[PDB]
Amino acid sequence: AASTIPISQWPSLLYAPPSSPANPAVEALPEMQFDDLHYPRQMLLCRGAGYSLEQCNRMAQPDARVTPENPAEKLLKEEAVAAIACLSQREGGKDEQCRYYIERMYKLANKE
Amino acid sequence: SILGAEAFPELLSKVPLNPQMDEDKHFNKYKWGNEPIPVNRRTGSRMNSSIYDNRNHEAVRHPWSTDARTFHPNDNPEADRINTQYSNMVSDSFPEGGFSDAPRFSSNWERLLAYHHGLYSPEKFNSTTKTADEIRLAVNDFAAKVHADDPKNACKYLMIEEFKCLQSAQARIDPQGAATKCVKWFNEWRQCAWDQEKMVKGYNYIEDRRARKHKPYIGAPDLQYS
Amino acid sequence: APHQRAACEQLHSEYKQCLAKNGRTHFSACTDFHSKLRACENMLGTSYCIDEGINLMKCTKNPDPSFCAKEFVAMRECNRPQGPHLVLSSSPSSPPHYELRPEVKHLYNVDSTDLGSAVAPVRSKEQLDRVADSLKADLNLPGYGHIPYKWESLRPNPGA
Amino acid sequence: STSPGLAFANLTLLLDVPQLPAIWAVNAWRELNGLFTEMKTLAGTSDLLYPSNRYNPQNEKTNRMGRPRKYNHGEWMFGNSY
Amino acid sequence: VDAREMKVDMYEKLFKQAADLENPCRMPGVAYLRCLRDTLTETQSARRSSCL
Amino acid sequence: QGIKTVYASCRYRKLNEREIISDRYTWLHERMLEDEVERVLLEQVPAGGFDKTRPGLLLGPST
Amino acid sequence: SSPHMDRLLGDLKLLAAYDSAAGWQEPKAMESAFQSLSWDDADVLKALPQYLNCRGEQKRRVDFAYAALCPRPVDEKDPKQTLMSLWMKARLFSYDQKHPFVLSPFAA
Amino acid sequence: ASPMLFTD
């Protein structure tokens, strides 16, 4: 059923992957970013402005141009906190002990 | 005082990180078992590929001594390849840990000379495969930089596509193999460049009158093309 | 004389404006300005491509089989600030040649200033033979003219 | 009259002889468009017109491919830039 | 204005041939020249505020 | 069709002439713009020209 | 004697196991991984509501570190993924508010 | 998304 993906189809595989029990956001895969040039560029700009290494290191800040945050963390806050409480109390939800909260979250997120 | 007590939940709870670990430690938590990745696909050396090469399917020769056992791609794969992710697909054409052809130089001048003559880049020889996430990050950064360079460019996505294909084909370690895949997008970009220039600078030509037998049959439709 | 220089720049701009207003079909109206522009040229050591522009305008309405190419390149090389880089050599010889000034030779990828004749060659069996023999000699390929199979016939060259 | 062996010809006729009026109308429309284009050319144009081309968008402010002309804001001593 | 457009095009061609996409100064240079293209039909005094 | 072809041949000849001359006029226009730009640039050259012997920018020591 | 380090490495191993089991279609293995994911850590539990309300430099540091370790964007619909992301972020927030992160290569 | 992800 799962047939081989040739090498020519890998660029399409990266941005339209097959279905899994744990899929990513295919619509947001073009939005995942992490700049390895952020701090070097910052340092170059500051040293061109005229600062010393200590001043540059004090002014350095981490990149804001990274992958956006999951909106579920702000929308389903209380539900997620309750689920985490249930997991911490019931040993990770063994034998279906956090099914209540997990099903409420799933329904809220999916809507049939 | 034991070392790493809280650090092996995979061992305490019988959780396998992969079907190979499952098979080894006999956790038996993978319903479909494990087909082991053979050693010729787990490691090996770079080889020649083309049939128009005389030393085809032979290991690449370097100035240094190197194991001549080659990486063998999966040529007769099984029908069901349950994991069709990039992680499992890349193993059919490259080894995840990189090739076994890397040098340990006894001196710096050997390294210098190999580089000067075009026979060594650590990018190529001391390196692993790139993960899908890394590839996507690189591609998205390049696309952002190109969009900033010029939004109103028609060859934009073609350039982005050749970059994407090089990254996916692991051009750091197989540049010749990746160029073989990506030169099509380079050619399309080359075409788009002229197609854009001729639109910017109005360039056209005198078309001749219609041919007597433009249509093969009188009852045939002559679909009009710009 | 900076007053006169600025006055001449104003005059040149006025001439260009008048010429643009009239167009390149009606250009004999602006023969007014040559009187003063030639004096500007003789005074400042300047050129304003007057004769070349007029000749080009005259030619393009009654064009040559060359389609006025020599006029075009003459105008392009006149309009340069520091002077023409490329010129047409004057000769008693029949064929004219393109020539390059020496002081700009380092800007061009050339061995000499002679860029060849300004007219194409004339068709000749002998010139074609010469060129083909030279190319054959330079190539030095054993296998040219070899015929591994020829259609069997009383004719020496079957078909062609 | 007819027969099964003549199904090719029957279908071809039924489907094609109604199109002949349309074909002649298309030819006439093309000839008339060519006539009007040639009359326009005789009248005169700023930029040329390609007769046997599908579309001719070129004007004082437009290229021969429908884009704006580069370097067309000012005026030039030799007149039009084309 | 036509000669200004030509000068900016020469600048852009030269700078894009000189600096590749890996270069850090490429994006700022291209941005500055794009602002010049935006503000060709202006004076230097008005152009400074925009290209700064 | 023969009359049409004769007329079209004449028109195409004239059109080829006009097209050639138009392209050459566009070329000349662009080159004249380049000449104006160069004429303006030569004003920014310092008095006495460039010191072609030395580097314009000295960007490090030589000890 | 090294609980923070040990639990960090365990969390990372369990995340890798979850991803592998998802790729290989193994609900038993991935649910084992989810259940074994150190949900009984009082420090991370206490730092969870602090992370959920932090803002500015600390949040940007923790976001940078989380995008380093796990740059892939999880599906907004899968609560198990969402929760594991939240747990890892809370762990990093706790570590940062105990000993802040220094992410630049330039430092002295 | 990009135009080359389209195949159909």
Automatic annotation (TrEMBL), chain A:
Disulfide bonds: C86-C98
Protein name in the entry: Uncharacterized protein
Organism: Toxoplasma gondii (strain ATCC 50853 / GT1)
UniProtKB/TrEMBL annotation, chain D:
Record keywords, A-Z: Signal
Signal peptide (UniProt feature, chain positions): 1-25
Highest taxon listed in the record's lineage: Eukaryota
Signal recorded as keyword: yes
Name this polypeptide is given: Transmembrane protein
Automatic annotation (TrEMBL), chain E:
Domain of life (superkingdom): Eukaryota
Residues of the full protein shown: 105 to 156 of 208
Name under which the protein is recorded: Putative myosin heavy chain
TrEMBL record, chain H:
Source species, domain of life: Eukaryota
The protein, known as: Microprotein domain-containing protein
The organism's taxonomic lineage, starting at the top: Eukaryota, Sar, Alveolata, Apicomplexa, Conoidasida
